[PDB]
Structure formats: C-alpha cells, structure tokens
C-alpha cells in the first residue's frame, strides 16, 4: 500500500518533468519549411505466386532480394528487379505471422503461431534450403523477428515479453519483461544496440540489448500499438495503432512530437515505415490503401492505393529506391 | 532473360511456379474447420477417428473422399483479437457445449456470443454440438435446471430442458446469412463425422448460392 503511493508520485514527477521540457511543438517550429508537394508513386512491379494472405515481408540488404510469408505455408524469395523466384521454402506450420531476412543474406528466420522461430540456411553446400535451428521457449504467438547478426536474433511474442536468442547454442540469452499485454512489433535501431517494442497495452518502451533494461517508456496511444519503426538517425520512432493514429516519439525528449491523424481515417494502422531521408512516413491501413505522411507537417503527401485487401506489411529498400507492399489478396506490389 | 545464366534463372522461376500451382490444387480438396468451446467439453474427442498428425493442434480425419482439417485454438491463452483473423477463411465453426456443467454454461454462452458476433466470423456458419445427453439426463433429476438458468419456466422434462438450452445459444445469432446446425451428442456416438459432413456440404451450397447470384 505504501509502495503504491510511491509508484503514483514517481509518475507525477515524470509527467511534470516531461511537461517542463516542452517549449514548442514540432508542427510549430517547422512551419516555415516548404511542403514536399504531392508524392505520386506508380506501381512498377506486381509479385504474384502466393495463394493465401500475406502476413510479413522483409527487404534484402542489397535492395534486390525480398522474402514473403503467407498462410499457404510457402516461403518465397523474390528477385525484385526481374520478378523471378529465387527460393521457395515449405514451412512446417501454415500459421506464420512474421518473417525476417538476415543482414548478410545467408539466413532467413520466419515464424508464427507455432511459438517457434525457425531459421533457414540459404547458402548450403547441398543446394537446398534446410532448417538450421528451431528456437523454442515462447508460450505465445511470435511476431517481428529481427536479425542482429548471423548468430543473434531478437524475437517478440504474446507473452508480454521479448527475447534475445543465440542461434548457435539455441538458448535464450536475454529476456526483456515489463509489458502488460501482447507485444505486436519491434524494430532494431541502426546502431544495433537498442530497440523499441510496441505492445497491446498502448505503450512502446525502449529496451537495451546488452543490459536488458527498460531505459524509457512512451505513452499516448488510445488503443493497441500494431507497428513501429525508427527514424533513420536512430533518435526517434513512429508507431501505428488501432486508434487510426500515428505518432512520433523522441528518445531524447521522452515525449511525442506530433500526431498523424486524419478525420477521414477510421481503421487502424497495420504497418509503419520511413523513407531514406526521414521525411515521408508510409503507413498501411485496414481500408486497403496506404497513405504517405509528411513526417514534419502531418500532411498527406499522396496515397498509394491499388491493393484489394488489407495491407499487412510495408517495406522500404536500404537505398530508398522503392517501396514494397503486401496485402491479404496474395499480391506484392513495388512502388516508386 | 538475354544472358545464358539469366535464361536458366527464368527456367528455375518457372519450375518453382509449377510446383506452387500444383500444391495449391492439392490444397483445395480439404475443408478447414475451427474447434471452439469451454474446457472439458469434448472439444478434443468429437470423432473417434482422430489421426491427429502447446500451441495450435491440427486434426486431419477424412470422410467420403473429403479431407477435414480441425484446428484447435485452445491453449494459446492470449488475446484472441490478434490471431483469430488467421482463421477468417475457415469453412465453419465447430462449437462444443457440455450440458452436465451448470457452472461453465454461462462461460460457454459468453464464448458463443463473442465468436458469433465477431466481425471476421459474421458469415461463417456454426456447427454447434451439445454433448453428454445421458449425463445431463441423470443430472437434471438430482438438480433441476434452475440454478444455472433462473428464468426457466417450462416443464422439468429432458425434452423441454434440452431444447431450452438450445434456444439460448441460437438467440445470440442476431445475424443473417448465418445458420447454426445443432445436434445432440453423447459419449458413445460414432456418427459425429457423418453429422459434420452433411453440415459442411449444406454450408457450401449456401455460399455457392450467393456466389451464383441465385439468392
């Protein structure tokens, strides 16, 4: 009972300190920057071959190779330039919710409702793709696998916790706890030393991969957070929730900078991605179309559209040349 | 596709696509059903021809040249709103209710109410199974059907009591284009597969009728 009072006063101290740092909103300082106009983006490629809903997609580090997981139980690696299929990996469980690509192109980790993160080796001497390691230890559905190196991966689950794994040994090196709801997404910072995870408790909190410490927590959303992605400089991140609102939080100021809500938007955000410059905030919505937000003025700088069903995944190449979108209509479209 | 190496890469892609289409053909002869219900309600012992295969449990019994795949979602112990949309394309929903449990009956009704009126399952027909007729028949004599349902007013006979429970479950439908196929089952019933088969065939006709434009 006494500690409960201590908990409350600590929140008041944080709120007062957080409010005292606020001097001017982001939309008030950059009011003199000229708008970026209309970003009209045209479909350049249409990747077909999936026979079920597409739930995840990750870009290769060379901005040419893609990976996509679907309910059909197939894992396809695409040549984004010539639209060819490089690999086709049959999964054990057809219920895959996330699917990641290694930064070196050697491995691919891709898992889902089976509570297991399966890692596949592409550069094998036998010419086929084999399941190198199956990571187990999560009691809930898996989401947002992210490779750190060729032998280190961070995973998120519905156990209200995320885990840091060692692919060689197979043991859970570090476990990050503190969420009070299913964790739906995570993103790795460019300096590969920090990451943020968005959970169902309407809160995203910054975690340290080396120490396993919740350095900071961020609030403001009214519903569960569905996606997250860092600003390109690794000093801010953007979240997407079922509240049909996008928000930009700053790690140094510990306060949200601006909101990306529009009166015509009803359905929540599914995916969040940034451009190479950090000016266009692309977000996928449940009303079958993606919107491009000017991340500095909260102005809709065009709409992608085109898809027939809910857009479930977004992806921007490392060089920023193209944007890949996946939806439940079993089609991947590449925009530019 | 100009270079010699790129010509073989295109040949590899076309060979991959052939197997992708072939696997899709073999994935159209199976019926995907969803198992739901409270614990200890017989949701794992409906058909004695199991041929099963913590998390998701599959069951792939076959009947009359048709493949039935049953997905048991129990044991996840997570928020259903985040992964129940994966089963948006299931043919039907199989719900199991235990008539001898007077305490979990209200718990079962909450489960049925949430699932039936879910936004993803607004058109998926439900095959509702009422289990353990004999156990319920003996239980009602010892304790009347009034502690669980204080609003009951009809005769204390088995026929009226069992039908009264059925009416409550169908009172939660509240939607068109959806039909609830009920059936009373016991422990020593072998024709559960036959009951599922005729309901699934009946559900397919309704969806085909809407697609053809007749209705």
């Amino acid at each position, epitope marked *: 009972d006494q500690l409960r009072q201590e908990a409350e006063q600590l929140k008041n101290q944080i709120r007062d300190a957080r409010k005292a740092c606020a001097d001017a909103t982001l939309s008030q300082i950059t009011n003199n920057i000229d708008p970026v106009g209309r970003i009209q983006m045209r479909t350049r490629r249409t990747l077909r071959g999936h026979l079920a809903k597409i739930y995840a997609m990750h870009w290769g580090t060379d901005s040419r190779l893609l990976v996509s997981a679907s309910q059909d139980g197939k894992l396809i690696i695409w040549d984004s330039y010539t639209t060819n299929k*490089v690999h086709a990996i049959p999964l054990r469980s057809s219920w895959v919710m996330t699917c990641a690509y290694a930064p070196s192109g050697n491995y691919v980790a891709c898992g889902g409702l089976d509570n297991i993160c399966s890692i596949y080796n592409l550069k094998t001497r*036998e*010419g086929n793709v084999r399941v190198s390691r199956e990571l187990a230890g999560h009691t809930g559905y898996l989401s947002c696998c992210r490779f750190l190196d060729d032998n280190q991966i961070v995973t998120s689950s519905g156990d209200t916790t995320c885990a840091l794994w060692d692919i060689e040994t197979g043991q859970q090196t570090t476990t990050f706890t503190g969420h009070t709801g299913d964790v739906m997404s995570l993103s790795l910072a460019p300096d590969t030393r920090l990451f943020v995870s968005g959970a169902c408790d309407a809160s995203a909190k910054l975690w340290d991969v080396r120490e396993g410490m919740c350095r900071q927590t961020f609030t403001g959303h009214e519903s569960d957070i569905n996606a997250i992605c860092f600003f390109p400089n690794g000093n801010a991140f953007a979240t997407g929730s079922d509240d049909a609102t996008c928000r930009l939080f700053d790690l140094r100021a510990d306060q949200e900078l601006m909101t990306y809500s529009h009166d015509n938007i009803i359905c929540g955000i599914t995916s969040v991605s940034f451009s190479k410059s950090g000016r266009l905030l692309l977000a996928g919505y449940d009303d079958f179309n993606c919107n491009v937000w000017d991340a500095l003025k909260a102005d809709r700088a065009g709409v992608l559209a085109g898809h027939d069903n809910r857009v479930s995944c977004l992806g921007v190449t490392d060089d920023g040349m193209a944007v890949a979108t996946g939806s439940w209509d079993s089609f991947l479209k590449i925009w530019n | 596709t*100009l270079s*010699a*190496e*790129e010509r*073989a890469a295109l040949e*590899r892609s076309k*060979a991959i696509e052939k197997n992708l289409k072939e696997d899709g053909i073999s994935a159209a002869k199976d019926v995907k059903l969803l198992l739901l219900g409270a614990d200890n309600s017989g949701k794992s012992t409906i058909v004695k021809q199991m041929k099963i295969i913590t998390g998701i449990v599959e069951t792939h019994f076959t009947f009359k040249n048709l493949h039935f795949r049953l997905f048991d979602v129990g044991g996840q112990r997570s928020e259903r709103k985040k992964w129940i949309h994966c089963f948006e394309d299931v043919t039907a929903i199989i719900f199991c209710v235990d008539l001898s449990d007077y305490n979990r009956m209200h718990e079962s009704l909450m489960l049925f109410d949430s699932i039936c009126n879910n936004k993803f399952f607004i058109d998926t027909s439900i095959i509702l199974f009422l289990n353990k007729k004999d156990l319920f028949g003996e239980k009602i004599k010892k304790s009347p059907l009034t502690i669980c349902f204080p609003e009951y007013t009809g005769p204390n006979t088995y026929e009226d009591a069992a039908a009264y429970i059925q009416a409550q479950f169908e009172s939660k439908n509240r939607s068109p284009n959806k039909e609830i196929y009920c059936h009373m089952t016991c422990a020593t019933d072998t024709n559960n597969a036959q009951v599922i088969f005729d309901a699934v065939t009946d559900i397919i006709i309704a969806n085909n009728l809407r697609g053809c434009g007749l209705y």
Partner: single-chain antibody
Amino acid sequence: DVQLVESGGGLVQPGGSRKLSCSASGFAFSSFGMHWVRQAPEKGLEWVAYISSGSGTIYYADTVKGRFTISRDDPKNTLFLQMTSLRSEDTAMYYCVRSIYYYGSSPFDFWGQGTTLTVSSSDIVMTQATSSVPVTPGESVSISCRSSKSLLHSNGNTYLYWFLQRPGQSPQLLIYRMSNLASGVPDRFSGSGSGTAFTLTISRLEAEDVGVYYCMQHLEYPLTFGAGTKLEL
C-alpha cells in the same frame, strides 16, 4: 559430402558406342544442371554438353552436335552420356560438373573425379598470353587472358570463370564472375578486368597454388576455355 563419380571409361574401337554414367551422392541432384567437360591429353579442357534442371533445356558442342546425347535420371541421381560414333578425337578425361543458376549462385563450384576414355587408331575465342610462368613462393603472380567479344553484359555482370587444376586432381573454381571468390578458396586470390581484358592475381603465393589455370566464359553457349596457363616452381 558432395561426391561425383563417373564410370564407363576404357579402350574402345572407332565406330563403336559407349555410355558414361555420373552418379551423384550428397546434394539435391534434381535441382542442379549438369555439364560434361572433357580434357584431351596435355591439351586442355573443353565443354561438351549441358542439360538443364528437369531435362528442359539441352545443349551440345558444335564438334559433337548430333553425335552425342545426354540424359538425366533424377530419381536415380545418375547422369548419362551416350556417344554414338567415336573418332580418335573423342579420347579425353570426361568430367561431370554440377551447376545451379539463380541470382548470386555459384554454377561451377564442384567438378567430378573424371573418367578416362581411350580410342585406338562465330564462337567467343578466349586466348591466354603465356603457357608457363616460373615463380618462387611469396611473389605475387598475375595471370591475364583476353576474349573476342565483351563479356560485360548490359546487366552489369561479367561472365568469366577462373579454374585451377592441380597436378593429378580435378579443376576447382576460384572466381566465378569477375571478382567473386568461391566457397572455401583462400582469400589471397583476387580477380579483375574490364570488358575484354581480365587479370587474375595471386598475392603471397603458396606451394599448393601450382597448377594449370583456365579462364572460361559463360556469356553464351557453347562455353569456351582458355589455352591454359601453367605455374612452375
């Protein structure tokens, strides 16, 4: 362990027919394209025929076009080469090579052990400057060969392959496009080039690097090898 073994060699009379079998054990044979390469006595390597994965696309060399035939038995993991009429030119050590083609693949990594066949009594021309180069260990060696056309495709890839045939062994792939090191080769090897002139450099040469070096083009069929540069110590 990847292993290709060939059998069916021997002494045959002119005008007869022989069949060579290449049984594979250690890799997914059904996904690889298999070539036949023959090496005449102390003359050099020469491409013969190629069958694609799934027996879709088949090619033959102009020398033995319409005379040889290649067949593929995927369930048995065996590759055949049936020769109808044999002259005195057919005598050579026939090798069996696997090849897989996709974005970023290595289509000439593994060569078979080779079988010896003895018989009793337009195209891209690649030329190697020299035939014998004496050198001592620790000294960098540069090997260069030219070509008729420009192997640099419009896609940005240059199709040049460098092989090393140690004495008494089978050729081993070192560089497969212009500078892409093969799997398991030492990092001291490096390659470069510009369109029609290419160079292979070996820094900090070791005693086991001696042998005959061949440069081959894969821009267009038929595949043509170089004259062959021999390193002496």
